[PDB]
Design a protein around this ligand. Structure first.
Ligand SMILES: *[C@@H]1O[C@H](CO)[C@@H](O[C@@H]2O[C@H](CO)[C@@H](O[C@H]3O[C@H](CO)[C@@H](O)[C@H](O[C@@H]4O[C@H](CO)[C@@H](O)[C@H](O)[C@@H]4O)[C@@H]3O)[C@H](O)[C@H]2NC(C)=O)[C@H](O)[C@H]1NC(C)=O
Ligand SMILES: CC(=O)N[C@@H]1[C@@H](O)[C@H](O)[C@@H](CO)O[C@H]1O
Ligand SMILES: OC[C@H]1O[C@H](O)[C@@H](O)[C@@H](O)[C@@H]1O
Ligand SMILES: OC[C@H]1O[C@H](O)[C@@H](O)[C@@H](O)[C@@H]1O
Ligand SMILES: OC[C@H]1O[C@H](O)[C@@H](O)[C@@H](O)[C@@H]1O
Ligand SMILES: [Ca+2]
Ligand SMILES: [Ca+2]
Ligand SMILES: [Ca+2]
Ligand SMILES: [Ca+2]
Lengths: 46, 220, 589, 210, 214
């Protein structure tokens, strides 16, 4: 996911390599730059 | 017997940027939940596009005042991330860790003077190869855009990426091609009672702005 | 050279009070007084040890020095059980400046509690007195506090009056010791005064604003001087910045109308260029000339060894706007020549202003020395015409004779300005009076000057033989400015064949002697008195020496004891004026 | 393109506004996970080294880009050149623990030793800046310059002591390196470049033949 | 907006029983999130409660924007501030709180003034620098440009390393108002201009009631 120019995978279980995430119950600045008003705003002539 | 293996020479030394993970020492730790925290950004260039930051002019101010004389050159500076005007932008503080860029740089020009102050401005792009223009009439033969103040107080112009090669350097060495990408020249066509106003100017990254090949020179 | 040293006026104070750290003249409206600053003098102020006081010393008759009450109160309170100020050891009287009826004294080490948090910051303070009026003037005691502001300003470290009655004040600690020049007109200092307001705003205030951090610790306002430099009549502001330019020292000159920026710079590291400054027209061209002192300057001798001697830079103001800078070195090692520089006006009344420079830690037993330099057409005569010596020994802090001094004031109305010298190390202050200068037009004529040995004209009573005679004739004429006797008796001496144990070939006729004296009494401004007599040659067969010219010498001495006036101030004869002249006579063959 | 100046809405323009065409772009090198996944050198103490990421030089790549985010998450990877055995101890553990071998201890194997360390903070996310009780927010009232300013560098700043990944202790730790794994970042913050003295920050780039 | 210098962009905001109308509006800026995240967490044992009386505007003075103030002049307001309402009696009653902010800054001087203000909500503002002010638009912001508006409205959620906060020892948000172009009073402009804030907490949740000396 991060720094790879190779893909040798893991001897070990994910339960030992990293710390496991827990769910309770690209987000903001990717939607904010994608909602950027790109088009021209005036009444384009010529 | 057992499996024969040839331990090769030149392999296995620590490389500070190798795509390999270390060995675990301590297992079965669960993180506190952090799903849906506000403000997640995944790419440094997503924040450089959604958030323009100010330029820096003579006297260390983000604005350029309307001059009233035979001179009509407000700002005129090298199209370079290493420029002095760009030095306080987030786009140039983030480009100091890369050796090459490509794509479009947007400039945002927001006019500040009162409602009875009126002006007309002109931003042009001088490609490298000859000296930059000194009057608006000589710069009208470049790629330029011209706007004036009204109800809408911000105008955005996209510095086009013209170059011989697909990528250009973010640093500067000597008078050379890759480090001088031309100029960007701001002129004042007219003004009406706009004496001493301010035209604050921002800068951000374009749609196709790209920045590759990380490096660590110095000086955050 | 005309200063009285025989019996100069001595004044003293409490031991340890630093009596003489600052001195000035006080001329109101028709008695004359002396102002001595004693910044360590105990006062009767409630609970204030060594508040410091300024003493008005009566020059008339007795030698009484009555203290002056600018402030008799103690520490005012900000609130209940919360002192506002700290006048203890405030060094009041460290700088005293007077102009007519206005006396300005200051306390550089006066500390003040902020109007917010409980601090103790040396903003410094001053007290301005106009006859019956007396206000307080603390321009650095403001809302701008703590180091980066005016909190450590120590306003009043140096002060000066302009001709338009405007106060110039220096504070070396403003804005992290960048220093600050503050100028206020004496009108608003009293007019906008308010006993209940601690931070008074003055409408017409000129000040140097805060500058870049690289200008920190430069000490602007360390010393101050006034004079016009842009030719508009208004006195401009000259100030020493001794730590500026990486301890090379600078001197700033601002416009006295709007605090607009010339700038002098030093040649040696840590020579303290700007420790003292003075502005006086030294060459009679009515252009104020800049004097800058650097007591720590080191010079090299013929042995090529560095020695701290001190240096003063004499910058003559040209109409071109440029300066004609001349450097004058000290004389004794470690004497710190140039610590104090005092314009004297025209000390000898010759037509050009004069100036005094002191080496406070010079002379025998570190007593102190003051050098007197006379001005002329070309500029300042680099050779001192007089050397003033301290006469008091040390106790703990050296006598410091010459550490502060003031001149340019005709305090005795003799037509000649006088000089005060402060020796605070021994708590003394000394007034030197200027003796009247007498220019004298002496004359001597020998006719005929070519003597014919066989002439034999003048007969000689007693003998039938006649001798070869000739006439000797001397004249005196004297006059002087200021107050001085209209009668002047001199003692004239004449010698024939002055060149000769050897035989003198000429003698006077009506005495038969080569020597003749004449009590002569001429009048000041009156006509030239002239008495002549007959001298004769010896017989040809009385000497072989006929080739050597017979020199006729005339010498005169003034009776100083009888020329004295009232107090006993005896006049003096002009410098560079020959006290004796000589003509000669030849014999032919 | 004209627009409301103060809407704070992101307004992008393109080269189509005057006849160009926006080209495609590859942005893998500015990905937060990609770029923060390097070893960065840290100045180590003699024996004990609490593993805080704010100990990284701020002028570095990983140092400057980490401080460009208010809150962050990552697992940690450590490379250490040490003498004797190296002991690790999790977040919130006493110092006396650094002496006991039962804690994760890596015996000496030349030349160095790289360990994968998890996230052990009590917090859902760590912070590069934490407003405990500092700046009032009104131009820092002009106060400090001169000698104390070097001490005054660190006064306005600080951190709770739970923002760390534990400690390491060896007899003699010679070199230390951090590598951030699975880096997440939140709430971006300013990032400054070198301010040039000329009109442009020139530098010395590597020089081949032609 | 409108065809003339006159201006009609009406926007009303009701927090609780308190409204606020503006006719020179640019829109509300949402920072870092539009909604809230999960209030109920594993750290309060389900003992968190929502207090709806505390979600309403309170007013405060920021600074006088005079013509002598040049670029970079800041005013920092740490939130939550010293509050005398019912929201203030929550930091004396409960040990943990969390809330977003609804910030509305006002600068009334007629449209014949120049100058430009930048109001921004900055999280965890321990120290600001002179150069970092050039990148102050990385945060939820709006400009106040007297030729166009007088109001800047910025809504913003709860951020922190923890899900609930102890506001007596931590100020997560900071309202910074910066001069980006100095004020001008040309011929008809208002001589100075005062800057006011009209703040309101949102989604306030409290947990852990402390003892009382009452
Ligand atoms: C021989 O001895 C006698 C006696 O000693 C000498 O007598 C002298 O004659 C001088 C010329 O006459 C005489 O000069 C003064 O008196 C002059 C009138 O008699 C008068 O003209 C002179 O004024 C002028 O004189 C000065 C003198 O320096 C000249 O420089 C001018 O050019 C003018 O000529 C003098 O006032 C002198 O007084 C007189 N002395 C005596 C004692 O009799 C005589 O000269 C000798 N002559 C020889 C042989 O040399
Ligand atoms: C001509 C004559 O008698 N000369 C004398 C002189 O020798 C003496 O020195 C002086 C003292 O005042 O008085 C006269
Ligand atoms: O307005 C000019 C002023 O702006 C600020 C600094 O850059 C100064 O050096 C310059 O003198
Ligand atoms: O940083 C350089 C820049 O700083 C500020 C002023 O001194 C300007 O004139 C200068 O060009
Ligand atoms: O650099 C800005 C600065 O420039 C110089 C002076 O004009 C100051 O008054 C001003 O603040
Ligand atoms: Ca003048
Ligand atoms: Ca002169
Ligand atoms: Ca003289
Ligand atoms: Ca006299």
């Amino acid at each position: 996911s991060g720094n790879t120019g190779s893909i040798i995978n893991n001897y070990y279980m994910q339960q030992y390599q990293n710390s496991m995430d827990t769910q309770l119950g690209n987000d903001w600045f990717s939607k904010l730059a994608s909602s950027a008003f790109s088009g021209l705003f005036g009444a384009l002539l010529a | 017997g057992i499996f024969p293996v040839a331990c090769s020479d030149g392999y296995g030394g620590l490389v500070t940027t190798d795509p390999k993970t270390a060995d675990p020492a301590y297992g079965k730790v669960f993180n506190p939940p952090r799903n849906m925290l506000p403000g997640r950004f995944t790419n440094f260039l997503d924040v450089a596009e959604a958030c323009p930051t100010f330029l820096r002019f003579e006297g260390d101010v983000p604005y350029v005042t309307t001059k009233t004389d035979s001179d009509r050159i407000l700002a005129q500076f090298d199209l370079s991330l290493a420029a002095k005007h760009m030095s306080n932008t987030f786009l140039a503080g983030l480009a100091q860790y890369y050796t090459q860029y490509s794509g479009t740089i947007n400039l945002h020009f927001m006019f500040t003077g009162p409602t009875d102050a009126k002006a007309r401005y002109m931003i042009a792009y001088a490609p490298p190869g000859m000296e930059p223009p000194k009057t608006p009439e000589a710069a009208a033969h470049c790629i330029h855009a011209e706007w004036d103040t009204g109800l809408n107080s911000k105008f955005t112009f996209s510095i086009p990426y013209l170059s011989a090669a697909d990528y250009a350097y973010t640093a500067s060495d000597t008078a050379e091609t890759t480090n001088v990408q031309g100029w960007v020249c701001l002129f004042q066509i007219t003004h009406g009672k706009a004496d001493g106003d301010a035209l604050v100017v921002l800068a951000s990254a374009g749609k196709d702005f790209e920045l590759r090949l990380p490096v660590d020179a110095r000086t955050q | 050279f005309n200063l009285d040293v025989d019996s100069p006026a001595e004044y003293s104070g409490p031991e340890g009070s630093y009596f003489g750290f600052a001195v000035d003249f006080f001329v109101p409206s028709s008695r004359m007084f002396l102002l001595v600053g004693a910044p360590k003098a105990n006062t009767t102020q409630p609970g204030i040890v060594e508040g410091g006081q300024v003493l008005k010393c009566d020059w008339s008759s007795t030698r009484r020095c009555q203290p002056i009450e600018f402030d008799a109160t103690g520490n005012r309170d900000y609130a209940k059980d919360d002192p506002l100020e700290f006048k203890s050891h405030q060094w009041f009287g460290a700088s005293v400046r007077s102009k007519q009826d206005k006396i300005l004294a200051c306390a550089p080490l006066y500390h003040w509690r902020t109007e917010m948090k409980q601090e103790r910051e040396p903003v410094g303070t001053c007290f301005l007195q106009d006859g019956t009026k007396t206000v307080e003037y603390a321009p650095c005691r403001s809302q701008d506090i703590d180091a980066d502001g005016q909190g450590f300003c120590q306003g009043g470290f140096s002060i000066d009056f302009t001709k338009a009655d405007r106060v110039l004040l220096g504070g070396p600690g403003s804005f992290y010791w960048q220093g600050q020049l503050i100028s206020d007109q004496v009108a608003e200092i009293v007019s906008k005064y308010d006993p209940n307001v601690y931070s008074i705003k003055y409408n017409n205030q000129l000040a140097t604003r805060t500058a870049q951090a690289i200008f920190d610790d430069s000490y602007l306002g360390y010393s101050v001087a006034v004079g016009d430099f842009n030719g508009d009549g208004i006195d401009d502001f000259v100030s020493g910045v001794p730590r500026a330019a990486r301890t090379l020292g600078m001197v700033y000159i601002y416009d006295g109308k709007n605090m607009s920026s010339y700038n002098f710079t030093g040649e040696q590291m840590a020579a303290y260029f700007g420790f003292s400054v003075a502005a006086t027209d030294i060459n009679g061209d009515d252009y104020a000339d800049v004097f800058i002192g650097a007591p720590l300057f080191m010079d090299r001798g013929s042995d090529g060894k560095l020695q701290e001697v001190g240096q003063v830079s004499v910058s003559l103001q040209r109409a071109s706007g440029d300066f004609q800078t001349t450097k004058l070195n000290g004389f004794e090692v470690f004497a710190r020549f140039g610590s104090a520089i005092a314009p004297l006006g025209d000390l000898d009344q010759d037509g050009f202003n004069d100036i005094a420079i002191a080496a406070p830690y010079g002379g025998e037993d570190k007593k102190g020395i003051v050098y007197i330099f006379n001005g002329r057409s070309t500029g300042l005569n680099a050779v001192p015409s007089q050397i003033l010596e301290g006469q008091w020994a040390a106790r703990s802090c050296p006598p410091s004779f010459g550490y502060s001094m003031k001149g340019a004031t005709d305090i005795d109305k003799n037509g000649y300005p006088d000089l005060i010298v402060g020796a605070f190390g021994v708590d003394r202050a000394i007034l030197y009076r200027a003796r009247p200068v007498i220019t004298v037009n002496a004359g001597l004529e020998v006719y005929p000057s070519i003597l014919n040995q066989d002439n034999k004209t003048c007969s000689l009573p007693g003998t039938a033989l006649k001798v070869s005679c000739f006439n000797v004739r001397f004249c005196l004429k004297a006059d002087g400015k200021g107050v001085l006797p209209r009668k002047l008796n001199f003692q004239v001496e004449l010698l024939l064949d002055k060149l000769k144990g050897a035989i003198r070939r000429a003698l006077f006729l009506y005495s038969r002697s080569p020597s003749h004296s004449k009590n002569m009494t001429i009048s000041r401004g009156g006509l030239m008195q002239c008495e002549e007599l007959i001298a004769y040659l010896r017989d040809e067969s009385e000497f072989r020496d006929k080739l050597t010219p017979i020199t006729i010498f005339m010498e005169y001495r003034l009776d100083y004891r009888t020329a004295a006036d009232t107090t006993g101030l005896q006049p003096i004869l002009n410098q560079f004026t020959p006290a004796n002249i000589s003509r000669q006579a030849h014999i032919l063959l | 393109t004209t627009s409301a100046g103060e809407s704070a809405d992101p307004v992008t323009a393109t080269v189509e506004n005057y006849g160009g065409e926006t080209q495609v772009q590859r942005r893998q090198h500015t990905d937060v996970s990609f770029i923060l996944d390097r070893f960065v050198k840290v100045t180590p103490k003699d024996q004990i080294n609490v593993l805080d990421l704010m100990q990284t030089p701020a002028h570095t790549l990983v140092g400057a880009l980490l401080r460009t985010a208010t809150y962050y998450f990552a697992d940690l990877e450590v490379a250490v050149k040490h003498e004797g055995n190296l002991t690790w101890v999790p977040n919130g553990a006493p110092e006396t623990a650094l002496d006991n071998t039962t804690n994760p201890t890596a015996y000496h194997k030349a030349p160095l030793t790289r360990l994968a360390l998890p996230y052990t903070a009590p917090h859902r996310v760590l912070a590069t800046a934490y407003n405990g009780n500092c700046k009032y927010g009104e131009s820092h009232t002009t106060n400090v310059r001169g000698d104390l300013q070097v001490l005054a560098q660190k006064v306005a700043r600080t951190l709770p002591t739970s923002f760390n990944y534990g400690a390491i202790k060896a007899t003699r730790v010679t070199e230390l390196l951090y590598r951030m794994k699975r880096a997440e970042t939140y709430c971006p913050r300013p990032l400054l470049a070198i301010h040039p003295s000329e009109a442009r920050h020139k530098q010395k780039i590597v020089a081949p033949v032609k | 907006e409108e065809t003339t210098l006159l201006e009609d962009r009406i926007l009303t905001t009701r927090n609780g029983h308190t409204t606020s109308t503006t006719q020179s509006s640019v829109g509300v800026t949402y920072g870092y999130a539009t909604t809230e995240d999960f209030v109920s967490g594993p750290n309060t044992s389900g003992l968190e409660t929502r207090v709806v009386q505390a979600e309403r505007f309170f007013k405060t003075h920021l600074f006088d924007w005079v013509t002598s103030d040049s670029f970079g002049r800041c005013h920092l307001l740490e939130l939550p501030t010293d509050h005398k309402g019912v929201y203030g009696s929550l930091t004396d009653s409960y040990a943990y709180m969390r809330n977003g902010w609804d910030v509305e800054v006002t600068a009334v001087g007629n449209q014949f003034n120049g100058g430009c203000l930048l109001v921004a909500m900055v999280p965890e503002l321990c120290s600001i620098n002179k150069r970092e002010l050039y990148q102050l638009t990385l945060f939820p912001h709006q400009f106040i440009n007297p030729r166009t508006n007088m109001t800047a409205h910025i809504t913003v959620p709860f951020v922190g390393v923890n899900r609930y906060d102890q506001y007596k020892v931590h100020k997560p948000w900071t309202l910074v108002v910066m001069v980006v172009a100095p004020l001008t009073v040309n011929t008809e402009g208002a001589p100075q201009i005062k800057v006011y804030a009209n703040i309101a907490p949102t989604n306030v949740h409290v947990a852990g009631e402390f003892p009382s000396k009452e």
